Amino acid sequence: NFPVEMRINPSTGAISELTLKGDNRSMNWVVKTDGTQYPWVKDNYGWGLGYFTVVKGRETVKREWRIPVEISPDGMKVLYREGDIRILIKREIKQGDLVEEYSFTNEGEEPVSLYDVAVYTPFNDNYPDAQQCINSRAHTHIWKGGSAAYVNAIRMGDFTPHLGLVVTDGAIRNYEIWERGRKKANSQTRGIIALDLPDLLLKPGESYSLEWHVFAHNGNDDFRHKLLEKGSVLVSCNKYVFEKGEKARVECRSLEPLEACTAKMNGVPVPVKQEGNLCFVEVPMEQAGEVRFDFYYNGNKQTHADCLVISNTADLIRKRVDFIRTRQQMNNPSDLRDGAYMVYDNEGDSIYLNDTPNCNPVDRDEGAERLGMGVLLVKQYLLTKDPELKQSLLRYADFVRRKLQTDNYVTYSSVDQKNRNRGYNYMWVAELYFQMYKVTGDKQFVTDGYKTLKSMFQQFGYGFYAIGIPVRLGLQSLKEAGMKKEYTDLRNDFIKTGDVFVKNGLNYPAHEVNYEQSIVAPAIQFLAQLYLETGSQKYLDEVKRQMPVLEAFNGFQPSYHLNEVAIRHWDGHWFGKRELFGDTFPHYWSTITGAVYYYYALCTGDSSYQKRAENVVRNNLCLFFEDGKASCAYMYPYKIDGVKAEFYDPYANDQDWALVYYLLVNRGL
Numbered sequence: 304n305f306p307v308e309m310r311i312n313p314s315t316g317a318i319s320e321l322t323l324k325g326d327n328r329s330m331n332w333v334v335k336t337d338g339t340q341y342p343w344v345k346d347n348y349g350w351g352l353g354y355f356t357v358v359k360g361r362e363t364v365k366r367e368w369r370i371p372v373e374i375s376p377d378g379m380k381v382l383y384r385e386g387d388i389r390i391l392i393k394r395e396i397k398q399g400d401l402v403e404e405y406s407f408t409n410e411g412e413e414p415v416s417l418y419d420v421a422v423y424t425p426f427n428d429n430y431p432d433a434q435q436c437i438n439s440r441a442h443t444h445i446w447k448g449g450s451a452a453y454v455n456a457i458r459m460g461d462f463t464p465h466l467g468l469v470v471t472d473g474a475i476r477n478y479e480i481w482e483r484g485r486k487k488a489n490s491q492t493r494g495i496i497a498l499d500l501p502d503l504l505l506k507p508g509e510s511y512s513l514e515w516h517v518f519a520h521n522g523n524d525d526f527r528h529k530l531l532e533k534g535s536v537l538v539s540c541n542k543y544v545f546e547k548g549e550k551a552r553v554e555c556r557s558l559e560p561l562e563a564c565t566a567k568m569n570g571v572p573v574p575v576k577q578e579g580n581l582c583f584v585e586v587p588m589e590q591a592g593e594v595r596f597d598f599y600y601n602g603n604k605q606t607h608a609d610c611l612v613i614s615n616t617a618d619l620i621r622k623r624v625d626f627i628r629t630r631q632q633m634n635n636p637s638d639l640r641d642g643a644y645m646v647y648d649n650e651g652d653s654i655y656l657n658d659t660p661n662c663n664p665v666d667r668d669e670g671a672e673r674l675g676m677g678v679l680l681v682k683q684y685l686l687t688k689d690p691e692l693k694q695s696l697l698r699y700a701d702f703v704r705r706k707l708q709t710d711n712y713v714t715y716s717s718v719d720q721k722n723r724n725r726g727y728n729y730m731w732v733a734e735l736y737f738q739m740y741k742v743t744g745d746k747q748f749v750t751d752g753y754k755t756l757k758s759m760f761q762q763f764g765y766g767f768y769a770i771g772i773p774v775r776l777g778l779q780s781l782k783e784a785g786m787k788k789e790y791t792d793l794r795n796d797f798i799k800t801g802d803v804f805v806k807n808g809l810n811y812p813a814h815e816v817n818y819e820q821s822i823v824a825p826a827i828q829f830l831a832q833l834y835l836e837t838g839s840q841k842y843l844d845e846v847k848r849q850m851p852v853l854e855a856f857n858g859f860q861p862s863y864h865l866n867e868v869a870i871r872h873w874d875g876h877w878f879g880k881r882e883l884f885g886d887t888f889p890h891y892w893s894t895i896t897g898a899v900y901y902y903y904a905l906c907t908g909d910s911s912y913q914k915r916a917e918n919v920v921r922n923n924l925c926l927f928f929e930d931g932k933a934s935c936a937y938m939y940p941y942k943i944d945g946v947k948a949e950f951y952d953p954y955a956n957d958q959d960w961a962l963v964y965y966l967l968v969n970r971g972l
Contacts, residue, residue, distance in 0.1 A: 304325075304399060304464075304519055305323040305324060305325045305326060305399065305464040305519035306323070306324045306325075306396065306399035306400075306519070307321065307322075307323060307324075307396060307399060307400060307401040307517055307518065307519065308321075308322050308323070308324050309321050309322070309401065311377075311378025311379075312336075312346060312349055312378075313374070313378065314346070314370070315346050315347075315349050315352060315369055315370065315371070316349075316351065316352075316371045316374045316378060316381035316383075316392065317336065317346070317349020317350050317351045317352050317423075318333065318349065318350035318351055319333070319335070319336060319337070319349060319350075320333065320335075321333050321350065321401075321466075321517070323464050323466065323519045325464075326464055328438045328439060328458075328462065330427070330438070330439045330440075330441075330458065331427060331439075332426060332427055332441060332456060332466050333350050333425050333426065333427055334348070334425040334426075334427050334429070334495065336348045336349045336350075336425060341482070341487070341488060341492065343482060343487055344425075344482060344495060346369070347367060347369050348423050348425050348481070348482075348495050349423065349425070350423060350424055350425055351381070351392055351403070351422060351423070352367070352368055352369055352422070353367070353368055353390075353420070353421050353422040353423055353497065354366060354367040354368070354419070354420075354421055354497075355385075355388065355407075355417045355419065355420040355421070356417065356418045356419050356420075357385075357386055357387065357388060357415050357416070357417055358415065358416040358417075358418060359387075359411075359413055359414075359415050359416075364386065365419075366385035366386055366388065367385075368383040368385050368390050369383075370383070371383050372384045378394075379393070379394040379395065380392070380393055380394070384410070386411070387409055387410055387411030387413075387415055388407055388408070388409065388410070388415070388417070389406075389407070389408040389410050390405065390406070390407055391404075391405070391406045391408070392404070392405055393406075399518065399519070400516045400517065400518040401516070401517040401518070402471075402514065402515075402516050402517075403514065403515055403517070404472070404512060404513075404514045405422060405473075405512065405513040405514070406510050406511070406512045406513075407420070407500075407503065407505070407510060407511045407512075407513075408505070408508070408509070408510040409505035409506065409507055409508065409509055409510075410507075410508075411507060412507060413507065414504065414505065414506045414507065415504075415505055416502070416503070416504050416505075417503040417504075417505065418502050419499070419502075419942075420499065420500040420501070420502065420503060421478075421497040421498060421499045421500065422497065422498050422500070422513070423481075423495060423496070423497050424454065424468070424496050424497065424498050425495045425496060426441060426443040426454065426456055426493075426496055427439075427440050427441055428440065428441055428442065428443040428456075428492075428493040428496070428870075429488070429491060429492035429493055430490075430491045430492065430816055430817040430818045430819060431491070431817065432813065432817050432818065433809065433810055433811040433812075433813070433817070433818045434810065436459040436460070436817075436818040437458075437459050437460030437462075437809055437818075437852070438458075438460055438462070439458075440458070440459050441456040441457060441458050441459060441465070441466065442456070442457045442458075442459055442855050442856055442870055443455075443456045443493070443496065443870075444456070444457065444858035444859075444860065444865075444870075445478050445496065445498075445858075445860075446858070446860040446861075446865075447475055447476060447477045447478060447499075448470075448475070448538070448606045448607065448860075448861075449474040449475070449476060449604075449605045449606045449607060450470065450473070450474045450535075450603075450604035450605050450606055451470065451535045451536045451537070451538070451604070451606035452470040452474060452475035452476075452498075452606075453467065453468060453469050453470060453530060453535070454467065454468040454498075455467055455523070455526050455858065456468075457522075457523075457855045458855070459818070459852070459855055460809065460852060460855075461851040461852055461854075461855050463520075463521045463522065464519040464520065464521065465519070465520050465521070465522065465526070466517065466518070466519060466520070467516075467517070467518050467519075467520050467526045467529060467530070468515050468516070468517050469515060469516050469518075469529070469530045469533045469535050470513070470514070470515045470535065471514045471515060471516055471533055471534060471535065472512050472513060472514035473500065473511060473512050473513035473514065474500065474501055474513070474605070475498045475499060475500065475513075476499050476500065476501050477499040477940070477941035478496055478497060478498050478499055478940055478941060479496075479497040479499060479940055479941050479942045479943070480493070480494045480495070480496060480497075480872075480885045480886065480940050480942075480943045480944070481494055481495040481496075481497060481943075481944055482494045482495045482944070483876075483883075483884035483885055483943060483944060484884065484944075485662070485876075489873070489876075489884070490815070490816045490819075490872075490873035490876075490877075490884070491816060491817050493870075493872050493886070494872075494884070494885070494943075499941055500513060516533050523859065531556070531557065531558040532558060534558065535557075536555050536556060536557045536561070536598070536600070536604075536606060537556045538553065538554065538555050538556075538596075538598065538606055538607070538608045538861045539553075539554050539556075539608070539859075539861050540552065540553045540554075540596070540608050540610055540861055541553075542610075542918070542921065543608075543609070543610050543611065543861070543862065543863035543866050543918075543921070543922055544610070544611045544612075544613060544863050544921045544922060544924050544925065545588040545594075545610060545611070545612050545613070546588075546612075546613060546614070546615040546616055547588060547589060547590065547591055547612055547613070547614055547615060548587065548588065548589065549587075549588050550585060550586070550587055550588070551584070551585070551586050551587075551588050551594070551596075551610060552583060552584070552585050553566075553583060553584045553585075553586075553596045553608055553610075554581060554582070554583045555581070555582040555583065555598045555600070555606070556580060556581055557580045557581075557582075557600075558580060559580055560577065560579055560580050561577070561580075561582055561600040561601060562600065562601050562602070563599075563600065563601070563602065564577060564582040564598060564599070564600040565598075565599045565600075566582075566584050566596060566597060566598050566599070567596070567597040567599070568584070568586060568594060568595075568596055569593075569595055570595075570597075573586055575598075582598065582600070584596060588610075590612060591612050591613060591614055591929065592611075592612055593609070593611060593612075594609075594610040594611065594612055595607055595608070595609055595610075596608045596610065607861075608861035608862065609861070609862035609863060609864065610863060611863045611924075611925050613924060613929070614929055616924065619924060619927055619929070620683065620927075620962055620965075620966075621683075621687075622927075622929065622930065622931040623679075623927050623931050623933060623959070623962065624679065624680060624683045624692070625931055626930070626931030626932060626933075627644060627676050627679070627680060627931075627959065628680065628691065628692065628695045630647060630652075630654075630931075631644050631645055631646075631647045631654060631676065631955065632644055632645070632695060632698075632699070633645055633654065633669075639706060639718040640669045640702070640706070640718055641698075641702065642698035642699050642701060642702030643669040643670075643673070643699070643702050643706075644673055644676035644677060644680075644699060645669055645673065646667050646673065646954055646955065646956045647932075647954065647955040648880065648953065648954060649932050649934070649953045649954070649955060650880070650953045655667060655954065657669070661882070662876060662877070662882045663877050665716060665717070665722050665723060666877045666878050666956075667878070667954075667956065668716050668717045668722070669707075669716070669717055669718065670703070670707045670715065670716030670717060670728060671716035671725065671727070671728050671731070671957075672727075672731070672878075672956070672957035672960070673956070673957060674703070674728070674731035674732060674734070674735055675731065675957060675958075675959045675960035675963055676699075676959045677696060677699045677700070677703070677735045677738075678731070678734055678735055678738055678959075678960075678963050679959045679960075679962050679963050679966075680692050680695060680696055680699075681696060681735070681738040681739065681741070681742055682738070682962075682963060682966045682970075682972045683966075684696065684742055685741060685742070685972055686966075686970070686972070693742060693743075696739065696742060697743075699735075700735065700736070700739050700748075703732060703735060704751065706718045707720075707732070708732070708755070711758065712751070712754045712755045712757070712758035713758060713762075714728050714729045714732050714755060714758065714759075715728070716728055724762070726759060726762075726763040726767045726769055727769050727770060729755055729756065729758065729759035729763075729769070730756075730759070730769045730770065730771055730772050730773060731770075731771065732755050733752045733753075733755040733756050733759075733773055733777065734752075734771060734773040734776060736748045736749070736751045736752035736755060737749060737752040737773055737776045737777050737780040738776070740752070740780050740783075740784065741780075746784045746786075748780075749780045749781060749783075749784040749786060749789075750786075750789075752773075752777060752780060753777065753781065753786070753789050753793060756777060756793060756796070757793075757796075760796050765796070765799040765800045765803050766800065766803035766804070766807065766812065768804075768811065768812065768814060768822045768825050768826055769825060770821055770824075770825045770828075770892070770895060771825070771828065771895070771898075771960075772797075772800070772825070772828070772829045772832075774797055774829060774832035774833055774836060775832045775835060775836060777793060778790060778793060778794060778797075778836055781793060794836070794837075797829075797833055797836070798833070798837070800829065800833075801829070801830060801833045801839075801842050804826050804829065804830060804845065805830075805841060805845045808845070808848065808849075809849070809852060811823060811826070816873065819871070820853070820856045820869040820870065820871060820892065820893070820895070820896065821871075821892045821895060823849065823852055823853050823856070824853055824869070824892075824895035824896050824898075824899055825895060826849060827846050827849050827850065827853055827899045827902075827903075828895055828898050828899050828902065830842045830843075830845050830846045830849075831843075831846050831899065831902035831903055831906055832902060834846065834906055835902065835905060835906060843906055843907075846903065846906065850899075850903065853896060853899060856869040856870050856896070857869050857870075857893075857896065858870075863921075863922045863925055864888040864889060864922070864925070864937060864939060865888055865939075866918065866922055867896070867915060867918050867919045867922065868888055868889045868893045868919065868922055868923075869890075869892070869893040869896055870886070870888075871886075871887050871888075871890040871892060871893065872884065872885055872886045872887060873887075874887050874890050874892075874935065874936050875887050875935075875936045875938050875952055878935045878936065878952075878954065878957055879935050879936055879938075879952035879953075879954055879956070880952055880953045880954045881938070881950075881952055881953070883938050883943055883946065883948065883952075884943065885938055885939070885940055885943035885948060886938070886939040886940050887936040887937060887938060887939065888937055888939040889922060889923045889925065889926065889937060889961075890936050890937075891923055891926060891935075891957065891958040891959075891960050891961035892960070893919065893922075893923060893961075894919060894920050894923050894960065894961045894963075894964035894965065894968075895964065896919055897915075897916045897917075897918075897919030897920040897964055897965075897968050898916070898964050898967055898968065899916075900912045900913070900915045900916035900919065900968075901913060901916040901967060901968045904916065913968075916968045917968060917969065919968075920961065920964055920965040920968045920969070921965075923961040923964075923965070924961075924965070925937065926951070926958045926961055927958075927961075932955060933955040933958050933959065934951035934952050934953070934954070934955065934958060935952050935954050935955060935956035935957060935958050936951070936952045936958075937950070937951050937952075938950055938951075938952065
């Protein structure tokens, strides 16, 4: 089919190039580690190199293997010796698949403990431009599944072949990201991935072995089939976020029946039923919080699923809305931001006033993406009819109209109006106004929505790939308000935009990132809505062409953080208190894909997409806490450039859009 081919660095023993024979695009699946792709990415990051911290009593030393003590002529056997630790790599190409075996041996006289043991796997996951991304870069779907860990690397344009890595001996417990920073291509690269082994304790002469297979495949089904053929397992749950009292069904699928399969729920044994090559657990979810399901099988193997239990969804949203109103709205006549919904510091329990040094003030200001708090409160008002929300919203909408806009509908994100005039901001302001018509019956909101959109098209033209262009909402509001001339005019403006997107196809222009899910998803979000309003097949045919490209951003890992959640890896820097670049899983714009799936199901009648939409938005509920607080990003990897991650950023900033889209998907609002 597509045998793996490689070039081995003769000085380090790393895999410097990994290609698939018969790929007409000749993609390199790794980042170049000679400084020629990124100047700061040099040969210490080669695939198969790595590091560990060795501890013997009080003596702690970090070692990085880079220069072999022995390397075979063909580069298929490489031996390193770093202090007491021997690292042997044995490579073989077997039926077109690369099989690598890493053994770590304590050759010393005393036991050693190894911590933060990792192998660099510098998958070529970065965003130089749309054309190179589509043909020559990969969305790297990492699953830290222990003995059943894997990486599914999907070429960003969805063209086969794709690449898989399946662990077949030992385990991968997590991953780290290296080489992020403002001066290291900022948002435009995922950085350098390192796969973390378990922490180890090795007596003298004892070894730990890790083996994996790297192989070509033809897509998610073929990847899954091959993973099972290689003797690993696949875990899945009926859902990844549960309301208290719901029943979870967790399945572990293998090729052949598992031997001695047992399970645990948060470390507590639970019964497993085995039916041939399926092992499953069914349990009630009776307590709020994280739930980890572990499977133990075949003597020494283990893997897991990560689930979340919440009290219940309706109350979660109610509490969030009440928090926004009672804690995150500026209530201070004689502050010019009076009425604004604002960034909030959950550590300090105070509104963030943007009066202190940070990496990008404009992304912590009183407008722009913070409009989502108003849009959320409207949708919740439409459900609940809470008069306190209405009063809060009237004040907000006044703040927006009077302080963030000029009389001619030029739209800023701060009261000074000295900062950027940015196309994204107009869509969200317009959405707010059209929603406010639904709250108030006041036709002036529909006029303001329409005129905001006109001001946007006047200034930015027709081919801006804005997020949440309110096509259905705007046109419905114009139809309902009886504004016939404005309806047809706006409809014609949307048709122009639709024609630009169709003509561009996969040649997506660069925006704030060169290529990303919140360029692709909004294109399709717009086109699907334009189809639902016009019935012109040309827009639906473009949706269908682009869907596989959007779906490639999303993995199927059995975690609420990851399952159908788009790869995004920069918003912690621009929006968070901790200012950390690196994988954010979930980041709330992943819900745009949910919106797309919702619209696609309306367009085609394919209800499997509605279930998928529900899954996407459900998984973003982890950003909202039971006291009404929220987080702008979950920083997912173990560490990023040595800094501990695995945390919710302590700012509530822009994440309330996830609930805006939750309510779209689930209630059509």
